[PDB]
From a paper:
The bacterial flagellar motor is a huge bidirectional rotary nanomachine that drives rotation of the flagellum for bacterial motility. The cytoplasmic C ring of the flagellar motor functions as the switch complex for the rotational direction switching from counterclockwise to clockwise. The basal body is made up of the LP ring, MS ring, C ring, rod and export apparatus. Here, we present two high-resolution cryo-electron microscopy structures of the C ring-containing flagellar basal body–hook complex from Salmonella Typhimurium, which are in the default counterclockwise state and in a constitutively active CheY mutant-induced clockwise state, respectively.
To obtain the C ring-containing basal body–hook complex in the CW state, we constructed the constitutively active double mutant D13K/Y106W of CheY (hereafter referred to as CheY**), which can mimic CheY-P to tightly bind to the C ring and lock the rotational direction of the motor in the CW state. The density maps of the LP ring, MS ring, rod, hook, and export apparatus in the CW state were locally reconstructed to the higher resolutions ranging from 2.8 Å to 3.8 Å. Although the structures of the LP ring, MS ring, rod, hook, and export apparatus in the CW state are highly similar to those of these components in the CCW state, the protomers of the C ring in the CW state notably undergo inclination and compaction, suggesting that the binding of CheY** induces significant conformational changes of the C ring for rotational switching. The LP ring acts as a bushing to stabilize the rotation of the rod, which serves as the drive shaft. The hook functions as a joint that connects the motor to the filament, which acts as a propeller to propel bacteria for swimming in liquid medium and swarming on solid surface.
Author numbering:
A (entry chain J): 37 to 245
B (entry chain D): 1 to 89
C (entry chain E): 4 to 256
D (entry chain O), J (entry chain N), L (entry chain M): 31 to 104
E (entry chain Q): 3 to 62, 78 to 136
F (entry chain I), G (entry chain H): 36 to 243
H (entry chain F): 37 to 243
I (entry chain G): 36 to 244
Write the structure that this text describes.
């Protein structure tokens, strides 16, 4: 194994890439994109302040990635801490549950495209896919899923504005802005139908399904 | 996920919008047409007296059918948010 | 030993990164501000990590005007691809805004052009529907694949360039209007007839019509008409995407 | 059931008991109790210093990562 | 190209300082070997030579393309070596300070450039 | 058993980094700031009072609302810890109690139930079994919902004024005027004749 | 009791950090800024005077208005401190009194009562003993209310002009002629003729 | 030739003024104003997005600058590598085609006004006009040209609107707004004649 | 008496930050851009020339207007500074005088009197003894008033065109025709044929004299 | 009745008393007053420096947190 | 083989060139976004 | 009537005067003047450096406050 | 005018840098009459001048960006 | 073969050198014949230099990564 | 702890060198005691035993009449050697700790 100085150096260096792991290998991207899109939808670009939404997204990600973290700890961190598995093998052992979690939520089309772009040989099963193919395929699938969720989220908040504008126009009040009238009604809707519990549960199911 | 599902999503959404807006628009249209035909019969022509009963009629429309609209739209949004994690791609 | 030649790796990983990131910042859905900047940068970095080793590395120094010419070339290619893709959504937005304006939804533009009071809500509705359809048809994967493919056609190394080709992209500005007219056509025409019908009502007893009976009727009719017309955009959506894609393939070369 | 707060508490405990053990060894060696050697005292003190530097560096990395995550805009 | 050319003089001077110190350390190591003529190089002429024509090697056992000249002995010795220790240690210290000077100049230039680029 | 003083200093100076996060997520700052932003939107002018004034005023209101909780923490945790009578960890555990009670009193049941569902919690039992990592997101969600409930009803009188003015103007005949332009001074008049700021602070304080 | 020099300069720099908050919440800057923004909105010219011009004008007006308070602070507090006559603590305490008096002069008793009752303060005899933590939010609220009052009053002549031009256009049958295009030049003419800028600044200064 | 670090500083500093170079020195203002006026003509102020109009103007500017870019490449890009001319003699030599283009597109009245604004009496020749006098004059000339092109675009749409309103009035209708009827006819006229391609061709011909 | 080099560098770099403030409150820029902000409103196109084009045109016009003042400052004050015959304090004292005179000639007496009274200043013997704290805000106030005067006067011919077009439209029974869209091209005609831009800039430059 | 300004004042005053005590002890040792040892003088000086650095770090964290809280878009 | 003198010098040169590329691209991207954030 | 410009000028003049006095004393000491000691020269230079650092920090805080105030949306 | 003054300042800074670099280069070859302290002082003066130029550029760029961001 | 492979190779080489020096030092401390103090001390010196080289490479590499991630897209 | 495992060997060697140094100095101090046997430890075997003390009698060289078997020269050389090895162990342990430190500093 490596010398203790080398192990400490590698540990300290790897501690740097934590935001990269959170953004490109974790459930954070979909949740943060959905939150940004929803904030764009309600007409309050500064309502839940970015820090509040970031904290909620962090807690949601921690609750969602719990089984993956548990599997990593039981399979990789526990043997490594007990001097049973070397430092250069704990990483390889722990990268597998995260790889599986990233795979299930990815999409065939992205996998096929990034298997073609690397000029790699045929991948008959998912067990032959390396991380260099799964990483951007997972990223693209997460982006597409987040945008789909946000774009079906956007529809009711535009429906309300449409009906508000039409009703205002029936009576000839053509110089009344419709957004100012629609914003309180959009807030009322998001209050009534458990705006956040339904969204939270839908996102959590969207991961576990 | 399929484009058929998407376009169905838009259609049902915008039919919900049509159902939400149809009573108010239709009530306003009927009031305007009635006031216009009365003006034609009486040979009275001022462009402002047709604007008066329209507001009252449309505002009564929320009194009578408002709960129905509020219950329909909430049900639509609730079902959409509940079915969100099953139309993911 | 312990060489790790850094200039070779930098020159191999830089220019493909510049082109990929130039496409990312302009390509639809991949350029939307809702994505955090670091996610976009990481996607570009990972795509370059996958692609660059197969390409022939360039040796022009970063401290030369040749490097500036290369960077300008990559930026031009990326923005051209992204913008040519964006033209289709521009066309859909145009058609939606025109349907909405014939609804009488925003009448204040006819009297006060650009007076901070405009709501093209139908334009937004069909814009997001078009984005959903583009996501469904996996257009973004194609965009990434074509960004990769333009290398074989046009390598990183400085290559000479043509002219009317730029016009083509600029001439694509016509498509936004031309295709928009057709989408509308399937509804505006009937709306036109409706307005014509209202005219027949105004040829009767003077006044007492229009601004009091025309607006609600035409609003409801437009609503149900284009609600029924919603299933029609998807074949036109695929037609628009195919037009943009094969125009890009023909003209980029 | 893993706990990040529990893991941080365990690590802080490890550092604190290492420091306290070194301190008590120095205590006994200053008091004149037989069986304690000066080289062992110095080595234990230096080990405690290394452990505290470990903790400080991990703190720096964690705080920087948290600040960069929380400085992001949605 | 431009940055490579601007930093090339001091880099080459520092490399030649390293090679000259290797030669001086070899002279110090062989100071008690009978029949060893002390070797040294003309720093300025070899520096200009490496400047005009790039660095080259005899093989690559490998060694530089520098001209190893003989130092004039001070006083005779029966064993037959011309390594006079005072000369060796004076040249060693002088080469040490000049190498540190080269490091300082090169580091100053590189910071003088990061200052511009940083923003 | 107690932590070393170096460990105590490290933990204490590291914990100050979460001060904005504590103030935003865990205190009353979020609801007050959301209500203030919504009121600014409802006034007809988007940036009449600068963000700085509203932020400072919300900070003062949060301090005044949380002063009893701060006093309870000082009596229970800060004072006996500073006198070297309890350890740091036990002081933190004791001081987390009044803040937990404050967070619970304003927490929706459905939010807590959902976030316990997502955290695999099974037999919870006493309201005094909810962990901090489960209680916090539920409190944030309840605060967002409550702030929206307050904002959409703050919007009501200004919509009433807008609709009344637009209806009167168009029925009278002048349909080419912008109703919002004439309505804004009347919105300001309504806000100043009701004592909108004082009553709004009273309502925000009494919401707890 | 006198703070050591390093502590003194630490306090000085930390206080210099809080300068914009003091300017916004303790001086007359906020009211002038709000009135200027409302006036700019009232003329129909949302971006005619650049924000920097109005901010500089408000800063200069605030300096002129607060010159007596600054002179009192210099004469009573800062000058003895600079001649080493008094310590920093007592100098700050003495300098608080003139600013406190100025802020009390421009506050409303109802807001002071609201913040006193909210903070559970004991009965206070006279204006002599009112904590700054109580006075600052009340003064900010009073400034907001006064600024809105002034802006709403200022909105009146332009409303008169808009209504009269709209009526003149409508009585001629010109149904689709918007009145804003005709009203904007006449709003500018009205504001120019009455010497509007200097008159409004003089009115703002006189109200303090 | 001066120091490399100073060259880097100057280059990165000059990179900042790229929007200024695009707006003041090239033709980008003309196409952008023409597009804005044309959009105002059709009665829809948000039909094509501002982003799309900006990108179309950018592509048109790139083509219409392609000859000047080629002259810059011949006079500056190439000889800077062969080191026959470099640094000073070249940057100015490369800027010379821009001077020729802006002299071509600038009216004499604007240049005369900006000269008498700078007390530059002995400005006798027309190829030695300083940049300080040439730039704002060129911008004003571009504004005038863009407004003229916008009015020329306005003429047919105004004619169509007037015709539609006249037929509505003659047919007996006195309440129907002509804008709603005339908008689709404006679009069908714009598409049928293929207005866009001829507009770009004329703009390219307009230099 | 001269400041140290470190203090001189500190003061120079600190004063470099006030460049936008100096430009707005001390030079011609404030009168120019504001008028532009109104002119684009008179033409009926709020879009108009882009914002940056107008800002840069105003900057060039401002430089041309202040060329005499800049030359006088360069001759009287900065030249001895470069040729070492003056200090930084004396240079700051001497170079401001031409700019103070330029500000005073465009300053209305009423505003200057208002700010004196508001600063409780003693009896100022003559223009030369007016403090800068009193001259700056008074100059800004007079500048705003003059800019509004110029803008209102500019608003006249376009009002004439709008009124004539609306009267023609209404006299023919075409009551339902919005005259703004019809009159916009004729406003562009008026600005083109009369050479509106060159005439306006010449008028502004002559107004400052 | 807990005021954060009061606690900040108390901590600042305590730092000041520590610094003043160390300064006076060094002053007295320099004047050759019997009963003062050099080791205690240096130890109290170092303790004063540690207290002042702790105050500096606390002020830095508080000011940073205040600026992050005070710059959000409402 | 290659000595620290060459390794460090090329390492620094690569760092400098990468920083220059990053800064130039940032300037270009800022200019492009300023152009596209226009109002036509 | 207290003016802030006058106070800033006075502070700058004080900093410059202290720096000039230290520089003059060091120059005289280098020239072999008898009645000047090295410890005084170094202490005066350090005091001038401290004063100039205080001036720099005050300028930084003032500039930050001004740039925050002038960045408003009024 | 202003561009001329900026060009003159840049030329002076670059002449400083070139003189320092040439003196250090001559001293590296072992040329007599050039002392180490003079080389170091000239290098530090050149660095100070270049840093001053960088700071002036930063302030001017910030001022230009602030001016160009106004809402007409 | 790749950049990650090269970094892994460099880390393995540095660790192997350090372990070799440590093992020789322990063998000398053990009393086994043939191991000279000169070689032990020189090998420890070389191992320290190699460790410092690795530390510097890590520092720069981290700095470059932070610079790249700071780029605004 | 892994940190102990890295520094276990050098710490045990240093402690064993100190103990043997004490034993050798005790042999020197009791040189004149009649009937005192010179005792010593086998460094390598005890180092094995601690890593995974017993005193061994020194073989006498010259027979004295008072029964003292302590030889000056042998134990003086052993004392100097043990001092040198203690210094070497201190150097090695300090180098390892300093390397572990510069890995962390940053």
């Amino acid at each position: 194994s490596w010398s203790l100085s080398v192990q400490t150096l590698v540990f300290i260096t790897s501690l740097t890439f934590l935001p990269a792991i959170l953004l490109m290998m974790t459930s954070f991207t979909r949740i943060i994109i959905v939150f940004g899109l929803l904030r764009n939808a309600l007409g309050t670009p500064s309502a839940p302040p970015n820090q509040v939404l970031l904290g909620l997204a962090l807690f949601l990600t921690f609750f969602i990635m719990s089984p993956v973290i548990d599997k990593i700890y039981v399979d990789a961190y526990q043997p490594f801490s007990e001097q049973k598995i070397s430092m250069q093998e704990a990483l390889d052992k722990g990268a597998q549950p995260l790889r599986a979690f990233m795979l299930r939520q990815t999409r065939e089309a992205d996998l096929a495209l990034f298997a073609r772009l690397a000029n790699s040989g045929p991948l008959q099963g998912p067990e032959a896919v390396p991380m260099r193919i799964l990483l951007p395929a997972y990223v693209t699938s997460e982006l597409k899923t987040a945008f789909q969720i946000g774009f079906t989220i956007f529809i009711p908040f535009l429906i309300i504005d449409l009906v508000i504008a039409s009703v205002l126009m029936a009576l000839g009040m053509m110089m009344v802005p419709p957004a100012t009238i629609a914003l309180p009604f959009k807030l009322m809707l998001f209050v009534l139908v458990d705006g956040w519990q339904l969204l939270m549960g839908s996102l959590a199911q969207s991961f576990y399904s | 996920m399929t484009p058929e599902s998407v376009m169905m999503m838009g259609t049902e959404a915008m039919k919900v919008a049509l159902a939400l807006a149809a009573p108010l628009l239709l009530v306003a249209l009927i009031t305007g047409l009635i006031i216009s035909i009365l003006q034609a019969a009486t040979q009275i022509n001022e462009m402002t007296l047709s604007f008066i009963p329209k507001i009252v009629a449309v505002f009564i429309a929320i009194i009578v059918a408002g709960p129905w609209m509020l219950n329909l739209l909430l049900d639509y949004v609730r079902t959409l948010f509940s079915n969100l994690p099953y139309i993911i791609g | 030993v312990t060489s790790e030649q850094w200039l070779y790796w930098l020159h191999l990983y830089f220019w493909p990164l510049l082109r990929v990131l130039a496409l990312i910042s302009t390509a639809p859905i991949l350029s939307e501000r809702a994505i955090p900047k670091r996610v976009k940068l990481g996607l570009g970095i990972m795509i370059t990590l996958v692609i660059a080793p197969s390409l022939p590395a360039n040796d022009t120094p970063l401290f030369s005007i040749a490097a500036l010419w290369l960077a300008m070339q990559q930026i031009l290619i990326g923005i051209a691809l992204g913008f040519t893709m964006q033209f289709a959504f521009a066309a859909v937005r145009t058609a939606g805004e025109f349907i909405g304006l014939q609804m009488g939804l925003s009448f204040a533009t006819f009297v006060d052009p650009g007076s901070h009071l405009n709501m093209p809500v139908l334009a937004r509705i069909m814009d997001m529907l078009a984005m959903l359809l583009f996501l469904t048809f996996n257009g973004h994967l194609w965009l990434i694949s074509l960004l990769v493919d333009t290398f074989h056609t046009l390598p990183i190394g400085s290559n000479p360039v043509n002219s009317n080709a730029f016009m083509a992209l600029a001439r694509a500005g016509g498509l936004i209007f031309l295709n928009g007219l057709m989408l509308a056509l399937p509804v505006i025409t009937l709306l036109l007839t409706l307005n014509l019908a209202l005219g027949l009502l105004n040829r009767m007893a003077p006044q007492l019509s229009i601004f009091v009976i025309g607006f609600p009727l035409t609003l409801t009719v437009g609503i149900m008409l284009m609600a029924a017309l919603m299933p029609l955009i998807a074949p036109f959506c695929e037609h628009l995407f195919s037009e943009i894609f094969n125009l890009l393939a023909d003209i980029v070369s | 059931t893993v706990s990040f707060a529990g893991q941080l508490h365990a690590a802080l405990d490890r550092i604190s008991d290492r420091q306290a053990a070194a301190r008590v060894q120095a205590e006994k060696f200053t008091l004149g109790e037989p069986g304690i050697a000066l080289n062992d005292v110095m080595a234990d003190m230096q080990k405690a210093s290394v452990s505290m530097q470990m903790g400080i560096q991990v703190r720096n990395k964690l705080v920087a990562a948290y600040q960069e995550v929380m400085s992001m805009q949605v | 190209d431009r940055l490579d050319a601007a930093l090339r003089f001091q880099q080459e001077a520092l490399n030649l300082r390293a090679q000259r110190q290797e030669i001086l350390a070899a002279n110090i190591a062989n100071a008690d070997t009978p029949g060893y003529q002390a070797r040294d190089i003309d720093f300025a002429s070899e520096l200009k030579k490496v400047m005009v024509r790039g660095r080259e090697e005899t093989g690559g056992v490998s060694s530089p393309a520098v001209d190893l000249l003989y130092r004039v002995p001070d006083q005779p010795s029966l064993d037959g070596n011309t390594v006079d220790m005072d000369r060796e240690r004076t040249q060693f210290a002088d080469n040490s300070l000049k190498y540190q000077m080269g490091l300082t100049v090169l580091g100053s230039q590189l910071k003088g450039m990061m200052n511009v680029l940083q923003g």
